[PDB]
Design a protein around this ligand. Structure first.
Ligand SMILES: CCCCCCCCCCCCCCCCCCCC(=O)O[C@H](COC(=O)CCCCCCCCCCCCCC)COP(=O)(O)OCCN
Ligand SMILES: CCCCCCCCCCCCCCCCCCCC(=O)O[C@H](COC(=O)CCCCCCCCCCCCCC)COP(=O)(O)OCCN
Ligand SMILES: CC(C)CCC[C@@H](C)[C@H]1CC[C@H]2[C@@H]3CC=C4C[C@@H](OC(=O)CCC(=O)O)CC[C@]4(C)[C@H]3CC[C@]12C
Ligand SMILES: CC(C)CCC[C@@H](C)[C@H]1CC[C@H]2[C@@H]3CC=C4C[C@@H](OC(=O)CCC(=O)O)CC[C@]4(C)[C@H]3CC[C@]12C
Ligand SMILES: CC(C)[C@@]12C[C@@H](OC(=O)CO)[C@@](C)(O1)[C@@H]1CC[C@@H](C)[C@H]1[C@@H]2OC(=O)/C=C/c1ccccc1
Ligand SMILES: CC(C)[C@@]12C[C@@H](OC(=O)CO)[C@@](C)(O1)[C@@H]1CC[C@@H](C)[C@H]1[C@@H]2OC(=O)/C=C/c1ccccc1
Ligand SMILES: [Ca+2]
Ligand SMILES: [Ca+2]
Ligand SMILES: [Zn+2]
Ligand SMILES: [Zn+2]
Lengths: 693, 693
């Protein structure tokens, strides 16, 4: 009979598997087992009797451990029996690490009892305050903080001190666990509620550094991410506890050194805090400065008002330029009026581009449409460099719409330079058919057309301000990452198959003269030389994705049936792989990404729209192009703000603690430790009655 | 060693983080802590003893607050201990806002005790009746309503009174919270069960206005949506409690001022109420008036009966026209017979359109097929204007099938007018090859063909009456919204790339004469001038989505390789972006939308089919075209209906309250407040026994 030779033992090596305690320990004796059972049942009577008997005769080890690791004190703590715990403490049982067990079980009375005076379930670095913060119990954390406890200060991510490197080399696991435990203690909402001068600010900073740690710490990434999410949720709930608009303005306008704290939240990407309904209500109130009742207005009225303000944008800009203090001078200063004016200016620029789209002069002078376009381009460039000067270099490069604006402005500058070069180096009127391939006019036209495409695509950034197009834009932005990830391997496969096809087909490259219409390449009516060169092969394989490459391009002029079949088989394999596998894989990745983002789409859109709104709150950059390039003719107070913020924060912390306790109390589902402790109370009552009677 | 300089403190600024109570409060003394612990443990003995000791010696503040905010009265309420609460009340403890805590914990005895005679967890606007309605406890709500309590009347959404605007400017957060709390109290199913003359009607109106508020209130939208859903669910459950058909007819036929209440439910879009199984059973009984056993019939029998009635539709219409009172005169009056006759008439119209589809006369007289079609068109127009006259203008424009009917009828009218114009302004027989581009006959034919397309697509509305095609039609209708949302940005990208391509390629526009077949555009065998004009560029980029635009259209006649490559690169970028990114994004959005609608697809289909059925219940509009344009030869009772409806509503409310209490009682999952109160009972029993013994 064939058997499993070795499953649990090696040297034992017939039809049975004998079982033994391989890692045998020290078993409890009869009296020790009886004493521990009496402690478990909670009868004070025989527990006390056995304690006195062991004191007198030394027959029983009162520090005996249940083979599972629990002692009499640990059992009493687990049973939440304060009387038996007091009795054991008065008999001087071993109290080592029992405070940690009491903290974890969250017995306030046990914590006070142990504060008033081997194997462990906790790592050696765990301290009572650290574990109390981990449990997030406000009572125990406060009780421990009333005594002078400290939390070791974590080092920076890029720290390279002797202590950090020595600890990492000696024990990387212990160092990582200690860092994670320290950050878990620090990120405790109850510990941030206490012991923190600015809980909101601390949460913002803690979430940011925890996200950075999750980035750097490739392992243990989920723990740091959930700690950062906990900090963000704590900040959002603190903002939720606000009960009046005055408190909200105090919170949001507070400067640690208007809406300073909201700008700090935006800097740390606290999307949940920013997307809070009250903060969004205040932001909408500031946004619709001119219209107090824009929210309750019919869509036709809103559309008519928007069109009227857009048509009136030049007059508003001129009024601001001449007299900033008037009925119309400061009208454009309103954030929504400013947004409408800027949108109208950009739409006018795009309309002028379209009109420009509406012949044999080398380097012709710019037309009236180009002359009108030029101030808009200069205004865009000046606004770009002004954003660089004001917001700084780091802030500008973070935005990708800023990258698109830089590309578009560089293309416009190149177009202007090429037009100037063509004007100054060309005077005659030569027909375009005989122009050079790299003629300056042709390159200028190409760059202008690409700039027009980019300028018209820049309108997608305005989708953020809309309730319907906003989350759509967010979804496209999120799935562009999957687009890039799939595009990497699409380009790899494209390069592989292009290399193969070109290696096969470069022997049959033909001159353009031999072609029916003197046309060489796949952009001809009769496609030819599709895989003659590597660049043409890449273009052909790209165009095969859309079916624009005909099948006869795999046929050579000679009667090489085997070579033509091999090329057609490479082409078919590329079609299969790329189209079916890669495109449908991309569809699946985008589907899953869409399901992931749909839960958080609203908060992301609100954060992006808040950024867009605060972009229009500042005094600078009010004039849209081309009016931004027109030279215009032109402590005790801190302490009281700090005191008001501190009072508001105290009220918020009290409300948050009460709400969190209420949420914990009203959570459906009881664990069996409550059942065992209820059993303990009932059994103690039964035995006490029996002793009395 | 690099450290995190400031995490919890700013000015403290080495390797540790000292912890202190930054927002320090007043700690409880020893005797106050002991008294509160005695209250928590529920021992009446030392609680009473400490109360008397504080009364005599003033050593203990009986109003001392646990640093978490709970006082002795609050702890007693949380422990559900009525004896200790009575003892505290007899000793005149502070009772402020304790009624709210008792209401929230839903202790009926505590509520009666407090009715019989700082920091808070409730907002200042919360009133006992409001919080009782929020908790949806029928007992406490009834107890508070027996005393003369009031709920502040909410203002309208578009209200612009001095009070509303002053409250919004002074405190927008408080005003919004107060409005939400008032509507939460009003939308309470238990409070609607009481205090409401017509609970069903109140629920319909409350859900409607809560949905309107969710629309207007962009923030706090989820709360208003869930309140409206709660009102709809309450109405649906009230309809569920019906136990007999007589009660159902009493409910549905009740007029507040047949099936009046069902029409009111349809007006408020109470889809769950309408899709109730008993209401649908009654609607099916009314729908199959002629056939008492249509439900239990073989599919072949149903198909044969439907075909027979459809073939017999002209005779039924003529019989109704001549003698409305006969065996066949009122047969078409039945809703299902009427539906079959109308479907047969429309199918005959479509068959005649197809026959019309089955040559050199300018403005020819209409053929026999067109002469037969004309009465159908006149009937459709007359039915449209009759729906305008009867149902009103607002009701008509809400339907989108009504918009399609308007477009189709306008196209038919334009076709008739153009045919008349061509007949009266053209007599000779000129070959069609030399006709003008805008010849009236050609435009009339084009409009007639578009009208035929619209008329044949109108059949999709009939999918609602089918069990399989109904939810499919609902799903298509739901995803058309995503179609439009994606089409917005598709058109934006299309305009951007069309602008770029036209700006690049408009220099190479060629005359049609220079083309091989005198054909200019992409609708030619050899496509050319694809990006010469903006409209042609838009058409070319549209047709590139389906692969119908060949690649050689990016080649210019001249040898401008750089320009051709730039144009081909714009074309490839447009293909990539539009097809891959945008189409697959649309696929993902439609997938997610389908998952969202699949849960509610059945209710939506039932509501739509109910609307279709009640469209055939009315006396008017019985004759289908072309028979609708043939001129035919032609209180005490309210009080008893109100009393019957009131009795039925009383029975329904009693049943609903009993069912909701049963549902609450049989919900799996106990929260830990029950565990703590069980501990309180056990501990009170233990201490009472100890005191006795
Ligand atoms: C040699 C001849 C070549 C001829 C080529 C002609 C055709 C050129 C057409 C270029 C079109 C590029 C594609 C633009 C698609 C924009 C889609 C934006 C969607 C979106 O909402 O993303 C936002 C950011 O936008 C952004 O990320 C910015 C979008 C644009 C960035 C890249 C700009 C490339 C410019 C190329 C110039 C080529 C010049 C050639 C001479 C989100 O924003 P978020 O911040 O939340 O981010 C969240 C990231 N998940
Ligand atoms: C210049 C030459 C032009 C030549 C053009 C020739 C081709 C024209 C073809 C037009 C076809 C338009 C597309 C019709 C698709 C109908 C799909 C209906 C699906 C559906 O069930 O939606 C129902 C409502 O129907 C509806 O919403 C109504 C559908 C139709 C509304 C739009 C009608 C457009 C008419 C265009 C006329 C053009 C004339 C040009 C001279 C749901 O119903 P619900 O109420 O539950 O809604 C729920 C909303 N989620
Ligand atoms: C799609 C084709 C026909 C080209 C049309 C180009 C523009 C005329 C469209 C494309 C995107 C549209 C924009 C999409 C996003 C918004 C944000 C939207 O913001 C609001 O909803 C106002 C309320 C607020 O945010 O304070 C205002 C309209 C606007 C500028 C739209 C104005 C009209 C735009 C510029
Ligand atoms: C698909 C091609 C062959 C063109 C055929 C056109 C018509 C002959 C088809 C297309 C849609 C069909 C309709 C789809 C929906 C319905 C609702 C359906 O309603 C029922 O199930 C009867 C029970 C009831 O609702 O009371 C009756 C058949 C009918 C009119 C179908 C009749 C036959 C129709 C008109
Ligand atoms: C759009 C532009 C960047 C393209 C489009 C080509 O232009 C032409 O071919 C004119 O002759 C060109 C020159 O530049 C390159 C040749 C090979 C390939 C890398 C092409 C590039 O295309 C993609 O980068 C990826 C496309 C893709 C993505 C997802 C699914 C399927 C395809
Ligand atoms: C790629 C290569 C293995 C192919 C591609 C053909 O080469 C050509 O035709 C040149 O003339 C060839 C010879 O060898 C076979 C002919 C019939 C079929 C089996 C083809 C094979 O293709 C697939 O095995 C499956 C393709 C597929 C997969 C998913 C969805 C759709 C299609
Ligand atoms: Ca910019
Ligand atoms: Ca109609
Ligand atoms: Zn270090
Ligand atoms: Zn008002």
């Amino acid at each position: 009979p064939e058997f499993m030779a070795q499953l649990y033992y090696k040297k034992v090596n017939r039809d049975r598997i004998p079982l033994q305690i391989v890692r045998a320990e020290t078993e409890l004796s009869a009296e020790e087992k009886a004493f521990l059972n009496a402690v478990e049942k909670g009868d004070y009577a025989t527990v006390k009797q056995a304690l006195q008997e062991a004191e007198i005769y030394y027959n029983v080890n009162i520090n005996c451990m249940d083979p599972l690791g629990r002692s009499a004190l640990l059992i009493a703590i687990e049973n939440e029996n304060l009387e038996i715990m007091e009795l054991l403490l008065n008999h001087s049982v071993y109290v080592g690490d029992a405070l940690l067990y009491a903290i974890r079980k969250e017995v306030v009375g046990a914590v006070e009892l142990l504060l008033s005076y081997q194997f462990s379930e906790f790592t050696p670095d765990i301290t009572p305050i650290m574990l109390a913060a981990h449990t997030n119990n406000y009572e125990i954390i406060k009780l421990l903080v009333q005594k002078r406890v400290t939390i070791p200060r974590p080092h920076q991510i890029r720290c390279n001190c002797v202590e950090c490197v020595s600890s990492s080399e000696v024990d990387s696991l212990r160092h990582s666990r200690s860092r994670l435990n320290i950050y878990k203690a620090l990120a405790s909402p109850s510990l941030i509620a206490l012991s923190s001068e600015d809980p909101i600010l601390t949460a913002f900073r803690l979430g940011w550094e925890l996200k950075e740690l999750s980035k750097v710490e490739n392992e243990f990434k989920a723990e740091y991410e959930e700690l950062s999410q906990q900090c963000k949720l704590f900040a959002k709930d603190l903002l939720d506890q606000a009960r009046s608009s005055r408190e909200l303005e105090i919170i949001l306008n507070h400067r640690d050194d208007d809406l300073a704290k909201l700008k700090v939240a935006i800097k740390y990407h606290q999307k949940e805090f920013v997307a809070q309904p009250n903060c969004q209500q205040l932001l909408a109130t500031l946004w619709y400065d001119g219209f107090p009742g824009w929210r309750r207005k019919h869509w036709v009225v809103k559309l008519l008002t928007c069109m009227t303000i857009g048509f009136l944008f030049p007059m508003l800009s001129i009024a601001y330029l001449i007299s900033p203090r008037s009925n119309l001078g400061l009208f454009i200063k309103k954030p929504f009026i400013k947004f409408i004016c800027h949108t109208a200016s950009y739409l006018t620029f795009l309309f002028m581009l379209l009109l420009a789209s509406q012949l044999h002069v080398q380097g012709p002078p710019p037309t009236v449409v180009e002359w009108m376009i030029l101030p808009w381009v200069l205004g865009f460039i000046w606004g770009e460099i002004k954003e660089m000067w004001d917001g700084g270099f780091t802030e500008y490069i973070h935005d990708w719409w800023n990258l698109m604006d830089f590309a578009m402005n560089s293309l416009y500058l190149a177009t202007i330079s090429l037009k100037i070069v063509a004007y100054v180096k060309y005077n005659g009127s030569r027909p375009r058919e005989e122009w050079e391939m790299w003629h300056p006019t042709l390159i200028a036209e190409a760059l202008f057309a690409i700039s027009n495409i980019l300028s018209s695509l820049r309108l997608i950034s305005l989708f953020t301000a809309n309730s319907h197009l906003g989350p759509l834009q967010i979804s496209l932005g999120r799935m562009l990452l999957d687009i890039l990830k799939f595009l990497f391997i699409y380009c790899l496969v494209l390069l592989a198959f292009a290399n193969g096809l070109n290696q096969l087909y470069f022997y049959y490259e033909t001159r353009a003269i031999d072609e029916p219409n003197n046309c060489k390449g796949i952009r001809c009516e009769k496609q030819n030389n599709a895989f003659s060169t590597l660049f043409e092969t890449l273009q052909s394989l790209f165009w095969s994705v859309f079916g624009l490459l005909n099948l006869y391009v795999t046929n050579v002029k000679a009667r090489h049936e085997f070579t033509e079949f091999v090329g057609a088989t490479m082409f078919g394999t590329y079609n299969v792989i790329s189209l079916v596998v890669l495109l449908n894989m991309l569809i699946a990745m985008m589907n899953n990404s869409y399901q992931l983002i749909a839960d958080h789409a609203d908060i992301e859109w609100k954060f992006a729209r808040t950024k867009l709104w605060m972009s229009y709150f500042d005094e600078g950059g009010t004039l849209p192009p081309p009016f931004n390039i027109i030279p215009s003719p032109k402590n005790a107070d801190s302490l009281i703000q700090n005191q008001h913020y501190q009072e508001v924060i105290r009220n918020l912390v009290k409300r948050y603690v009460a709400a969190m306790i209420r949420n914990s109390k009203t959570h459906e589902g009881l664990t069996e430790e409550n059942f065992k402790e209820l059993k303990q109370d009932i059994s103690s009552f039964r035995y006490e009655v029996l002793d009395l009677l």
